[PDB]
Symmetry: C3
Subunit: 208 residues, 3 copies
């Protein structure tokens, strides 16, 4: 019974029932039918980042006019899981579901181009790999931006070195309004884990 | 030279002379001639519990009118060693040495019966195993009460459950006076040791 | 991280260069040419204890009229190394370099005798082993006192038991003046080490 603090940690487990890895597998044959192991696979499912993205006719719009607003929110999985990590890597996918009250007397088309990140519309050309769809027959514009980077990984909010990896540019001949839903491609991943931020609950606007 | 109390007891023996079990055996071949090992064997030697037990003629007297007075004293070995223990077991023996100024013109006899413990004389019959002696020819009445119990061991001063083991009842046609000396039988033992009480010395009755 | 002082000494050596016993041997092939191992060998080199030992003609002079003055000083090696030790053993050697303005019209000779230690000149005879030199042809009087002792070792400043080992007595027919240089013989050694005394620096005799 000497004097001085000590160590020798005593791991105790209550409830000597059954090894838990058998009980989990027996609980997902009856309640799920699926077994979500990795959070990387939630970066490959398309979750909608907006519901009404209103644009004007004949205006080249980068996705960083939308993504820069919705990265802070943490609504979808690529912006909620990004608060646990500090780097990323890989391309991104997009889907553009049409919700426009279209006219028949025009022919609407949806172009898509590449800009490097955070340039505007006037300081880039339109001579690159593109994709065009027609919303009267194909209301979903599906596009994939690859990973064309100078660096092997990208941080969040870096220095004045801008335009070091590619992104998407949107174009349409008519003033459209869409539902944007993004996900990562087959090589997209985060890394270099940190701890989480806070969360936000309801907003009741109480009487006093 | 760290801080904290410790253990590791240091048994030291003074006087490296000779192993003591040889010295004890060599000291009892010259001073005793006997070697008292066990205290159980002192329960088989008869020690006198009284010197003048005066009775009246034609009166059935239980030994618990005498034993209940002399259990508290601790004079003999069955009442001195009983303060170290809490239980007992087995029968008891008695001897009744006659010290009566007898007459020749009567025929004195000494009956002895069984009562269960702590009954009186009127609430028991006399139909049992008995013993009769004649003090004009046999001045010592030797009797043995067996162990006829409902329980495998008996405590000291139990509940209102009375009469759960047998005892002795005395009878004589004349007013006799005796020397009672008890001991245990071949199965008598104590058990379940506790610590001793105090002892009592002299009583001088000093002048102030 | 218990409470209590401890032990377990951590010998650390700076400068992982090369084993030093190789570096010392490589440094004495280039700077010394000699390797002084033992301090006992410095008791066999003659160092001068005085520079002008003036005597009178026809006077038997013990060396303890000089040695008792110069043992305290610590100038030579036998009086500087003696402050580290408490005993000694063995004989001593002497050399007497002549520095007298001699005359030709006399014949100078230098006798040397034995006294036991600390006697005077009048309480000893001259019948013993002697040595005579002539400073006109042999200016160095070399003599060796052996170890003729009652004890196997001699302390410093003992009791009133005096004259327990031999020493030297000087004699000369003329008033000479010499340079005395002593050393131990082939059996001389100190022993039974103690710690050193203090040392003495300069004496400037400053202006205030």
């Amino acid at each position: 019974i000497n004097i001085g603090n000590k160590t020798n940690e005593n791991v105790i487990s209550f409830f000597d029932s059954t090894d838990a890895e058998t009980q989990n597998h027996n609980a997902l044959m009856k309640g799920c039918g699926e077994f979500i192991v990795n959070l990387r696979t939630l970066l490959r499912t398309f979750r909608t980042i907006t519901d009404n993205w209103i644009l004007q006719a004949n205006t080249k719009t980068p996705i960083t006019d939308l993504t820069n607003t919705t990265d802070a929110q943490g609504r979808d999985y690529m912006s909620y899981l990004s608060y646990l990590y500090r780097f990323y890597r890989g391309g991104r996918r997009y889907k553009f579901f049409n919700t426009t009250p279209l006219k028949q007397s025009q022919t609407c088309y949806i172009r898509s181009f590449l800009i490097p990140r955070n340039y505007s519309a006037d300081e880039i050309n339109v001579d690159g790999p593109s994709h065009i769809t027609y919303p009267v027959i194909n209301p979903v514009h599906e596009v994939e931006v690859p990973f064309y980077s100078q660096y092997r990984k990208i941080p969040i909010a870096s220095t004045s070195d801008k335009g070091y990896d590619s992104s998407l540019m949107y174009f349409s001949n008519t003033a459209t309004t869409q539902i944007v839903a993004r996900a990562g491609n087959d090589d997209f991943t985060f890394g270099w884990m940190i701890g989480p931020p806070q969360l936000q609950g309801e907003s009741r606007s109480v009487a006093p």
